[PDB]
């Protein structure tokens, strides 16, 4: 192994430490353009998003505001009036979602940009102070080995003069070449120290190296988002989960205002609503009095002989025969209450879960023609009702009115 | 009480109930228009819903495809991935709210709307029918009255013609005089058969009038309802309820996921796949390993006398030297790492809960400057810890293979 030959390759192992120095920092470079890259997207992006989310609480207040442009009350009615009123709910929070935005979101992606271009410049500042540390240790050897490699050489060149000494000898001469020991064991102790100083020169870059790839590049990588990287984003994106969270529970609000007006929608009440506001419209009038004529003292039925066995007669056959229409009213209107029960069958289904429509038939025109055959039958099942009721009305009050100014006598 | 004064007060009495039946069917003739009216305002109201339902969904497919047009994975970045994945699904579950407004909501209005319009066509048909024959009972008794003031006035014609016979009388003139209590006895049976007939007539009338405003009309509101107007609205309206409560449950689906991806930010994470990506850039080199000249035999420090003592001086004397180096190195990072606490603690803050924002100071220039000066004086901290962890390495490193070779005798 040659003087050179032993220089050269340390210096081609060195010239590529250089080299990978320096693509440790060109590294770190396409990291922080990442950095303030993926910052720059976010800070887009909310640009954009808050735009969108106003738009879409324009158009919503638009619509709500039109139909509040033409404005008791029925149930019905109170359903589309909390309708459009959680319409005009969402605008409102989308207003303010818009603004979470761009005055608390955005703000903090324009900090972090910046702070991501400082905290890297200084990152970079320890890391040059660094790589300048270690480059130090490795030029150090340089001259150390240059010392070991010429005590090395000088401790042989005495060495083969000694053997040549010994060769000639074994007057002055054995006391003259007593000088090459003299010399041999002084370049042998220098060449030893030399050695020494080498193997722990040796030991210690070799110390130096690694706990510069192992440790210092480490915690230098770690460093740059101790600070706070995740730190600062874990707040950013938290406020964005609260503002949407507290979207969620408005609009969960609102909509539990509308599901309640569909529960306590009510025929019962729209009936008793609908005659206390026009209650001169369905007016009970006055009953038609008893009107004498000239002044005619008798006011009740003159029950008096001969009119008492007439009277007698048809009463006791009213009885019979309001009894048998009666019968054959109702066993109409069970009839009329099972058609009714039936159209209402049809219509109590529960065909609104639409929960299959954000997973990822022919007989429907028979069914339908079907409803308007049974309504058919119903109306024809009910003027029937009601023409036989407006007869057991007239023939009821003219038998009780029988009954009380005498009975069945 | 004249023949005329009776007649006259009836015909006022009728004439009103005309006027208030024919305003009854007029009164239902608004509430058809109502109707029809809400019908159509929840029909406009859902078309334009779905047209802004779909436009939201546009700007948000736009949004996230332009941010993905220009497309491992590190935690940050997989945050980002989430951001843009639900916004892609809530656009889509957009689309499909505005396709239920569309396919399924409307359809039902439009149904509705021809239901509302044809079910009261025939209402009114009941309508008439019944008001029709409530009028044959009232025009009924026109012609019982007008019988019993014929008869009541002839019954005290004949009383009259009595009582003057009586004053002329009390050869044949008292047997004469005979047949006008034949024609009296005669004309109060049969005033008291017109008197019965027209009290009969009263309480057939009475509570004709009785069930038609009491009953028939009460049963008529409830029949363009039974039919089941609330029943098809209550399915029509929780259409819309099951589709935003869909909705809700796929945003806060994927909410979760960013959510979940905020939690499982890692600072090690990032370090170690940092590392994975670019193996060879931070690639530890080959160790400085110990090069022989000229084929050098010895390999190991030589601790031969007269060196020995020298060792032993060296290295009893660095034990005590890297002691103290190592004393006040850390009690450095002691304060290096109360700094570092001190900018975390500042970082690790609880400002993301905007509730406060939904719900219906100067000081902060300090802060962020003070910010600036607890970094500036961290990395003054750590170029002074790392510039001391060099010269420990170096002094170690050579103490620890002075140890091996000898100890410390």
Chains 1, 2 share one sequence.
Not at 251 to 280: C, F, P, W
Not at 347 to 370: G, H
């Amino acid at each position: 192994k040659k003087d050179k030959e032993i220089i050269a390759e340390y210096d081609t192992q060195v010239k590529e430490i250089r080299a990978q120095l320096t693509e440790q920092m060109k590294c770190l470079d396409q990291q922080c353009e990442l950095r303030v890259q993926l910052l720059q997207d976010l800070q887009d992006f909310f640009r954009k998003k808050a735009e969108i989310e106003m738009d879409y609480s324009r158009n919503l207040e638009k619509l709500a505001e039109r139909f509040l442009a033409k404005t008791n009350v029925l149930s019905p009615v109170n359903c589309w009036n909390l309708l459009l009123n959680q319409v005009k709910r969402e605008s409102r929070d989308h207003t303010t979602l818009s603004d979470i935005y761009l005055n608390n979101i955005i703000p903090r992606f324009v900090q972090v940009s910046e702070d991501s271009g400082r905290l890297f410049k200084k990152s970079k500042e320890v890391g040059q102070q660094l790589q300048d540390d270690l480059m130090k240790v490795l030029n150090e050897l340089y001259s150390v080995m240059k010392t070991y490699h010429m005590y090395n050489a000088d401790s042989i060149s005495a060495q083969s003069k000694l053997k040549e000494a010994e060769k000639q000898e074994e007057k002055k001469i054995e006391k003259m070449k007593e000088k090459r020991q003299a010399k041999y064991t002084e370049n042998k102790l220098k060449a030893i120290k030399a050695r020494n100083e080498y193997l722990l020169a040796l030991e210690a870059t070799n110390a130096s190296v690694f706990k510069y790839y192992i440790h210092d590049l480490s915690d230098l990588i770690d460093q740059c988002c101790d600070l706070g990287y995740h730190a600062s984003l874990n707040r950013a994106l938290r406020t964005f989960l609260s503002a949407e969270l507290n979207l969620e529970q408005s609009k969960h609000e609102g909509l539990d205002a509308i599901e309640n007006a569909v529960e306590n929608l009510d025929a019962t009440s729209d009936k008793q609503r609908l005659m206390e506001m026009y209650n001169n419209v369905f007016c009970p009038p006055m009953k038609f009095e008893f009107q004498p004529h000239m002044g005619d003292m008798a006011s009740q039925l003159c029950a008096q002989q001969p009119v008492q066995s007439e009277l007698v007669q048809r009463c006791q056959q009213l009885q019979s025969r309001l009894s048998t229409l009666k019968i054959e009213n109702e066993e109409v209107k069970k009839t009329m209450e099972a058609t009714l029960q039936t159209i209402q069958d049809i219509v109590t289904v529960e065909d609104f879960d639409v929960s299959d429509c954000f997973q990822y038939k022919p007989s429907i025109a028979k069914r339908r023609a079907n409803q308007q055959e049974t309504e058919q039958f119903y109306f024809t099942k009910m003027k029937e009702y009601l023409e036989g009721r407006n007869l057991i009305t007239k023939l009821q009050a003219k038998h009780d009115l029988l009954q009380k100014t005498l009975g069945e006598s």
